[PDB]
Design a protein around this ligand. Structure first.
Ligand code: CL
Length: 122
């Protein structure tokens, strides 16, 4: 495996239902053109904010400096519903997060990063 040849970018975000609550969902476009050979090289995988937070926690085991990184968070306060400003900023933050992970040689064999960037067939 070499995730350092994988390119990923969040192309859009929307809200979905995870359990009972409104959950931001981010569409991650993944490109393996830099990988040679004959295989599937392009897809989009939707991931929920909660799946980014899970990924952060797992990768934080392998590389404990990642514990310092703050990801977007849903406000527990009353009247803090998800709006377009939060989706837009959370998307840019999560996108920057993906760029930073994929530039980090320590993760180029991360099974968790691989499973997160891989296709999701519900
Ligand atoms: Cl709320």
């Amino acid at each position: 495996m070499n995730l350092g040849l994988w390119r990923a970018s969040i192309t859009s975000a929307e809200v979905t239902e995870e359990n009972g609550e409104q959950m931001p969902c981010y569409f991650v476009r993944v490109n393996l053109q830099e990988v040679g050979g004959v295989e599937t090289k392009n897809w989009t995988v939707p991931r929920r904010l909660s799946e980014f937070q899970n990924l952060h926690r797992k990768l934080s085991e392998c590389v404990p400096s990642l514990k310092k990184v703050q990801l977007p968070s849903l406000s527990k306060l009353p009247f803090k519903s998800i709006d377009h400003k939060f989706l837009g900023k959370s998307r840019n933050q999560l996108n920057a997060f993906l760029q930073n992970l994929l530039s980090d040689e320590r993760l180029f064999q991360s099974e968790a990063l691989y499973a997160f960037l891989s296709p999701s067939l519900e």
